[PDB]
């Protein structure tokens, strides 16, 4: 790992995990992408540990779709296809709420989205489905804001980018998907516990900001506008080396902040195991989810260097 990207705490204290379904996952996702005419799963295989095979497969197919969507988004941006993007944006909002209606849409990107969403909706009650949808409507609109910014060459401010990135990276989607992976929709009072919330946040901030750190030199050279380091360079008059340093410090702080709040979240899980069956189940679900929040760190880190 190139020294500027090396994180000794990850290497020393976040040992990699791999879901045993990983060999079939890749090829099955490939088949799905081919069946859907849409054309990395190791990232998901090192993250949602303990997920039922069917849940991991649905998540990996969604991730692959997400990557294809990101490519289409990039292409509409650099070609200035405002109409095609607007129409796609509208169709994804509609398919998100009514995926069955869009399973055979003429736009294969929309039909693939609708199938992956339909499948993710088959694991937990409708209240989880509704929360997933609320979050992903927000992700689509954040992608529209990124379209605006990049087509106009606007570099968001630092705080502006941090808030936008929690949405374009889909922080709350990956957090939602913790729950079908451990087989339990968590009550609001559990998943909004400040330790759970903060652990979930820091896991995603680390993934997003580490991606920015690894991509900054490439993206500054390409004259791009959406990267934490680019916001720092543009609006704080940092050199590239200073910006690399600052992003790296923010990433390292995510890790040690996570260690503290993980300890709090696991103590909360202990408190949920109150001697009842439901309490034991909630406790096990929180423990599994927090462990996968931990797994996200190592999965993203080593994904970048493979």
**149 in a labelled binding site:** no
Q: Which of 63, 64, 114, 124 is CA-nearest to residue 88?
A: 114
Show the DSSP H helices in 36-102 as ranges.
Answer: 41-45, 53-79, 82-97
**116 in a labelled binding site:** no
Let me know: does 158 contact 235? Beta carbons within 8 Å: yes
**271 in a labelled binding site:** no
Q: How far apart are CA 201 and CA 161, in angstroms?
A: 15
DSSP 23-48: HHHHHHHHHHHHHTT---HHHHHTTS
Let me know: does 21 contact 56? Beta carbons within 8 Å: yes
**42 in a labelled binding site:** no
**74 in a labelled binding site:** yes
Q: Helix 240-272 to helix 194-221 angle, to the nearest 10 degrees?
A: 160
- Annotated binding-site residues for Mg(2+) read 70, 74, 211, 215, 219
- Annotated binding-site residues read 70, 74, 211, 215, 219
């Amino acid at each position: 790992v190139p020294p500027s990207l090396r994180l000794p705490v990850i290497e020393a204290a976040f040992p990699r995990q791999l879901h045993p379904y990983w060999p079939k996952l890749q090829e099955t996702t490939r088949t799905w992408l081919l069946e859907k005419r849409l054309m990395y799963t190791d990232l998901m295989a090192g993250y949602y540990l303990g997920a039922p095979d069917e849940v991991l497969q649905a998540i990996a197919d969604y991730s692959a779709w997400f990557h294809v969507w990101d490519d289409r988004h990039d292409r509409d941006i650099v070609h200035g296809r405002a109409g095609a993007w607007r129409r796609l944006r509208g169709l994804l909002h509609t398919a998100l709420d009514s995926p069955g209606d869009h399973l055979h849409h003429e736009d294969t990107l929309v039909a693939g989205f609708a199938d992956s969403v339909r499948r993710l909706y088959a694991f937990l009650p409708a209240t989880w489905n509704a929360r997933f949808a609320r979050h992903f409507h927000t992700v689509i609109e954040a992608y529209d804001r990124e379209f605006h910014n990049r087509t106009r060459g606007i570099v968001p401010g630092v705080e502006e980018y941090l808030e936008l990135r929690r949405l374009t990276f889909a922080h709350w989607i990956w957090t939602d998907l913790l729950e079908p992976s451990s087989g339990c929709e968590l009550p609001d009072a559990v998943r909004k516990h400040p330790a759970y919330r903060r652990a979930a946040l820091l896991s995603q901030e680390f993934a997003a900001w580490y991606n920015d750190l690894c991509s900054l030199p490439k993206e500054i050279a390409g004259d791009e506008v959406h990267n934490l380091g680019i916001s720092l360079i543009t609006h704080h008059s940092l050199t590239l080396e200073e910006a690399i340093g600052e992003v790296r410090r923010r990433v390292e702080e995510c890790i040690t902040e996570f260690l503290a709040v993980e300890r709090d979240a696991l103590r909360f899980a202990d408190e949920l195991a109150d001697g009842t069956v439901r309490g034991k189940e909630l406790s096990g679900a929180v423990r599994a989810n927090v462990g996968n929040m931990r797994n996200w760190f190592s999965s993203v880190y080593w994904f970048h260097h493979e």
